[PDB]
Amino acid sequence: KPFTLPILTLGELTNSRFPLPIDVLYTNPNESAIVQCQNGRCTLDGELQGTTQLLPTGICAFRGKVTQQTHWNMTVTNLNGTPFDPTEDVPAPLGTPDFSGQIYGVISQRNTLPANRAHEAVIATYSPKFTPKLGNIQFSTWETQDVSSGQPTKFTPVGLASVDANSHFDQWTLPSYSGALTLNMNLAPSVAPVFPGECLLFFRSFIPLKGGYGNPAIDCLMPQEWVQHLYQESAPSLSDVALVRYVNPETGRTLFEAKLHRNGFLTVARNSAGPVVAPTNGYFRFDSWVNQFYTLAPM
Amino acid sequence: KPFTLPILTLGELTNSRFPLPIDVLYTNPNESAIVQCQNGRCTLDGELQGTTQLLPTGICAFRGKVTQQVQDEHRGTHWNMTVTNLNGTPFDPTEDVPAPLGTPDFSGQIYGVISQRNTNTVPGEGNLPANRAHEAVIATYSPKFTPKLGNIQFSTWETQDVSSGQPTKFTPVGLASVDANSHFDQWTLPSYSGALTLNMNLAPSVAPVFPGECLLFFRSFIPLKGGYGNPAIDCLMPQEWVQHLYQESAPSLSDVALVRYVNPETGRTLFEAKLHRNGFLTVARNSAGPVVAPTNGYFRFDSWVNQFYTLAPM
Ligand SMILES: C[C@@H]1O[C@@H](OCCn2ccnn2)[C@@H](O)[C@H](O)[C@@H]1O
Incomplete structure (x- = not known):
C-alpha cells in the first residue's frame, strides 16, 4: 500500500x-x-x-468534575467520559497538554432544564498539583465563588495567561x-x-x-x-x-x-x-x- | 476513482x-x-x-481589527470590529459566498474570547508587543451583525481594556x-x-x-x-x-x-x-x-x- x-x-x-x-x-x-x-x-x-x-x-482539553476549592481541584476522566485508568500504557489522559506554562481558557459546567455557568480559568502545568496521570488537576479563577462541586465540567483552551x-x-x-x-x-x-x-x-x-x-x-x-x-x-x-x-x-x-x-x-x-x-x-x-x-x- | x-x-x-x-x-x-x-x-x-x-x-471564528467603542441599548460595553478573511487577506464582498468563510450560520448569542496582539512593539519591554484578552458575546441576529459588509459588533463585560486599531481574534466557546x-x-x-x-x-x-x-x-x-x-x-x-x-x-x-x-x-x-x-x-x-x-x-x-x-x- x-x-x-x-x-x-x-x-x-x-x-x-x-x-x-x-x-x-x-x-x-x-x-x-x-x-x-x-x-x-x-x-x-x-x-x-x-x-x-x-x-x-x-488538544489541551479536559473533562471531569470539581471536588473542592481562587483554586479548585478537579478529577479528570478520559475525554470520552469513561474513567481514566492510571495503569494504561500512556503518559497521561490523551489530549493532556505537553508543555510547561500557564494555560488560559474557559471552564464550563452543565449540572446533572439544568443550570449552567462558565468562567475564565488558568491551569499551571508546572505546579505540584498538576497530576493528570493520577487522575486530578487544579485550576484557578478570578471568580471567587460560583464554581459548583460534583457537576460535569469542561475546560476549553484559548491561549496562555x-x-x-x-x-x-x-x-x-x-x-x-x-x-x-x-x-x-x-x-x-x-x-x-x-x-x-x-x-x-x-x-x-x-x-x-x-x-x-x-x-x-x-x-x-x-x-x-x-x-x-x-x-x-x-x-x-x-x-x-x-x-x-x-x-x-x-x-x-x-x-x-x-x-x-x-x-x-x-x-x-x-x-x-x-x-x-x-x-x-x-x-x-x-x-x-x-x-x-x-x-x-x-x- | x-x-x-x-x-x-x-x-x-x-x-x-x-x-x-x-x-x-x-x-x-x-x-x-x-x-x-x-x-x-x-x-x-x-x-x-x-x-x-x-x-x-x-468554524465560528473571526479575525480583524477593532475600530472604536460604540453605543448599544443592550447590557454591556460594545465594540465595532472590521473582519477580514481567516487568512488575513481582505474580504472581497464581490466574491460568490454568503459571508467570509467560517462565519456562524445560526441566530444566537455566541460566547467566546476576544484577544489582541499589538502591531507596535515597546523597546523597554525587549521590542515585544502588548496583549489582552476578554470574554465577549456576538449577537448574530443584531442589525449590527453585517459580516458580508466586512464588519461586526461584539459586547464585553470588561468596560475599557480593548484597544482600537490592533489585530483582533475571536475564539468561540459556546452560547451566552x-x-x-x-x-x-x-x-x-x-x-x-x-x-x-x-x-x-x-x-x-x-x-x-x-x-x-x-x-x-x-x-x-x-x-x-x-x-x-x-x-x-x-x-x-x-x-x-x-x-x-x-x-x-x-x-x-x-x-x-x-x-x-x-x-x-x-x-x-x-x-x-x-x-x-x-x-x-x-x-x-x-x-x-x-x-x-x-x-x-x-x-x-x-x-x-x-x-x-x-x-x-x-
Ligand atoms: C501589557 C498590558 O497587559 C495587560 O495589563 C496588565 C498591566 N499593565 C497595564 C499596562 N501595562 N501593564 C493588558 O490588560 C493591557 O491591555 C496591556 O496590554
Missing part, C-alpha cells in the same frame, strides 16, 4: 499541540533543549504515540504528569537530526495571551491533519526515511526537499533560524523512500 | 458547525423549519458550499444564554448584510424525498455561560467528512449512495442510510431523538443506487 501525504496548503492545516491554525514553517538549528513533545506524535505507518488523539477539540519569568513558559519542558518526585512513563521518544548540516523543520503557530508583553509560539512536528491521515492509511514504511518535496503547484517546481523520518518528523538542510518564506499554494508531496545517508539539497 | 468515507467512530468525529466533538446521532421527523445551514456543506465529489472552509479552528430574549434558533440564518437584505450564494436546503424517511444528524451539546438549558447543534456531516470528500474528489456515479452503519466487532450492519449527492443523510425512522448504537460503529460505503431505493427500517 503506497505511502501518501494529504494535499493541504499551510493555510489549510492546524497545529497538533494547541488548537491553532498553522502560521509559518520554521527552523531553529541552535536549539539546545531536547525535543520530546507528546502531542502531535504519530509514526508513518499510523501508530499514535504519547498523549496524541484524533480530535482537534481534544502570561509569558513573564514567573510564568515558566517553555514549550520543550514536559510536565511531571504524576508529580515532582515521580518519573514520566510511556513517552514518545525524542527527535533530532542525525546528519551534519540538518536541522528540524517545524509547523509554527502563534498563541494568544491574556495579558503582558510577548509573541509566544507553539511548534509541532506534524500538523493534526497529517496525524489523522497517517492513522487512516496505515501504509507500511519501506525504509526509515522518506524523501518529500515542497512543491509550487502553479509552476510545478520544487521549492525545497526534506527527510520525513519513520517516527514522524521532518529535517532539512538549512543553517539559519526563522520562518521559511514560501508561496501560499505550496505543499509537501511524497517522492521516494531513501536512507539515512541521503544528502538533501540545501534550501 | 471509487467513492470512500473515512473509518472513524462517533468518538473520533467533530462537529462542522461549532468546535465540538460529536456526541450522538439524532433524528427529528416533525421539524417544521427549513434546514439550510451554511457550515458543514460539501458535495460528495468534493465541492465546498456556503461558508464552509477546512480548518476546525475556523438560551432564554427567550437571547433568540437562539439553530435553523434561522443570520442576515449577513443586515436587516431587510436578502442573503445570497447560499448552499441549498436539504430534505427527504421519499416516504418514511427523515434527516439524520450528527449532534453536539454546546456550553453555556449561564442560565438554564441543554442546547444542541446538529450538523449534516462531520468536519472530518468535509475534509475527506475535499481531498478525494471522487465522481458521483448517481444521485444517492447507499451506506451502512456497521459494528466492526461483530461485523453486523446496525442500520442503513442514504447519503445524498448534496451532502446529507436520510434514514427510514418514524421517531425523534438519539440513535443508541455501540461505540465502535461507523458508516461504510456500499454502492450507488437511486432515489427509488427502499431503505430497511431502522
Whole structure:
C-alpha cells in the first residue's frame, strides 16, 4: 500500500499541540533543549504515540468534575467520559497538554432544564498539583465563588495567561504528569537530526495571551491533519526515511526537499533560524523512500 | 476513482458547525423549519458550499481589527470590529459566498474570547508587543451583525481594556444564554448584510424525498455561560467528512449512495442510510431523538443506487 501525504496548503492545516491554525514553517538549528513533545506524535505507518488523539477539540482539553476549592481541584476522566485508568500504557489522559506554562481558557459546567455557568480559568502545568496521570488537576479563577462541586465540567483552551519569568513558559519542558518526585512513563521518544548540516523543520503557530508583553509560539512536528491521515492509511514504511518535496503547484517546481523520518518528523538542510518564506499554494508531496545517508539539497 | 468515507467512530468525529466533538446521532421527523445551514456543506465529489472552509479552528471564528467603542441599548460595553478573511487577506464582498468563510450560520448569542496582539512593539519591554484578552458575546441576529459588509459588533463585560486599531481574534466557546430574549434558533440564518437584505450564494436546503424517511444528524451539546438549558447543534456531516470528500474528489456515479452503519466487532450492519449527492443523510425512522448504537460503529460505503431505493427500517 503506497505511502501518501494529504494535499493541504499551510493555510489549510492546524497545529497538533494547541488548537491553532498553522502560521509559518520554521527552523531553529541552535536549539539546545531536547525535543520530546507528546502531542502531535504519530509514526508513518499510523501508530499514535504519547498523549496524541484524533480530535482537534481534544488538544489541551479536559473533562471531569470539581471536588473542592481562587483554586479548585478537579478529577479528570478520559475525554470520552469513561474513567481514566492510571495503569494504561500512556503518559497521561490523551489530549493532556505537553508543555510547561500557564494555560488560559474557559471552564464550563452543565449540572446533572439544568443550570449552567462558565468562567475564565488558568491551569499551571508546572505546579505540584498538576497530576493528570493520577487522575486530578487544579485550576484557578478570578471568580471567587460560583464554581459548583460534583457537576460535569469542561475546560476549553484559548491561549496562555502570561509569558513573564514567573510564568515558566517553555514549550520543550514536559510536565511531571504524576508529580515532582515521580518519573514520566510511556513517552514518545525524542527527535533530532542525525546528519551534519540538518536541522528540524517545524509547523509554527502563534498563541494568544491574556495579558503582558510577548509573541509566544507553539511548534509541532506534524500538523493534526497529517496525524489523522497517517492513522487512516496505515501504509507500511519501506525504509526509515522518506524523501518529500515542497512543491509550487502553479509552476510545478520544487521549492525545497526534506527527510520525513519513520517516527514522524521532518529535517532539512538549512543553517539559519526563522520562518521559511514560501508561496501560499505550496505543499509537501511524497517522492521516494531513501536512507539515512541521503544528502538533501540545501534550501 | 471509487467513492470512500473515512473509518472513524462517533468518538473520533467533530462537529462542522461549532468546535465540538460529536456526541450522538439524532433524528427529528416533525421539524417544521427549513434546514439550510451554511457550515458543514460539501458535495460528495468534493465541492465546498456556503461558508464552509477546512480548518476546525475556523468554524465560528473571526479575525480583524477593532475600530472604536460604540453605543448599544443592550447590557454591556460594545465594540465595532472590521473582519477580514481567516487568512488575513481582505474580504472581497464581490466574491460568490454568503459571508467570509467560517462565519456562524445560526441566530444566537455566541460566547467566546476576544484577544489582541499589538502591531507596535515597546523597546523597554525587549521590542515585544502588548496583549489582552476578554470574554465577549456576538449577537448574530443584531442589525449590527453585517459580516458580508466586512464588519461586526461584539459586547464585553470588561468596560475599557480593548484597544482600537490592533489585530483582533475571536475564539468561540459556546452560547451566552438560551432564554427567550437571547433568540437562539439553530435553523434561522443570520442576515449577513443586515436587516431587510436578502442573503445570497447560499448552499441549498436539504430534505427527504421519499416516504418514511427523515434527516439524520450528527449532534453536539454546546456550553453555556449561564442560565438554564441543554442546547444542541446538529450538523449534516462531520468536519472530518468535509475534509475527506475535499481531498478525494471522487465522481458521483448517481444521485444517492447507499451506506451502512456497521459494528466492526461483530461485523453486523446496525442500520442503513442514504447519503445524498448534496451532502446529507436520510434514514427510514418514524421517531425523534438519539440513535443508541455501540461505540465502535461507523458508516461504510456500499454502492450507488437511486432515489427509488427502499431503505430497511431502522
Ligand atoms: C501589557 C498590558 O497587559 C495587560 O495589563 C496588565 C498591566 N499593565 C497595564 C499596562 N501595562 N501593564 C493588558 O490588560 C493591557 O491591555 C496591556 O496590554
